[PDB]
Amino acid sequence: QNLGKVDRTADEIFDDHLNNFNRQQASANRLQKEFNNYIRCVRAAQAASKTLMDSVCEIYEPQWSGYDALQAQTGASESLWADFAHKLGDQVLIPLNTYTGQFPEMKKKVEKRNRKLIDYDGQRHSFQNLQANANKRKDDVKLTKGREQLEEARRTYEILNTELHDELPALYDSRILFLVTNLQTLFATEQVFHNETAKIYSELEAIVDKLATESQR
Amino acid sequence: QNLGKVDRTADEIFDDHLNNFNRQQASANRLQKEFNNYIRCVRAAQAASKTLMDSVCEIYEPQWSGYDALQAQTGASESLWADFAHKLGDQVLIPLNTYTGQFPEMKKKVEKRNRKLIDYDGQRHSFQNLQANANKRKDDVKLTKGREQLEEARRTYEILNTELHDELPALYDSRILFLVTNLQTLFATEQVFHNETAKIYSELEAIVDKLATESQR
Question: How far apart are CA A185 and CA B2, in angstroms?
Answer without folding.
Answer: 56
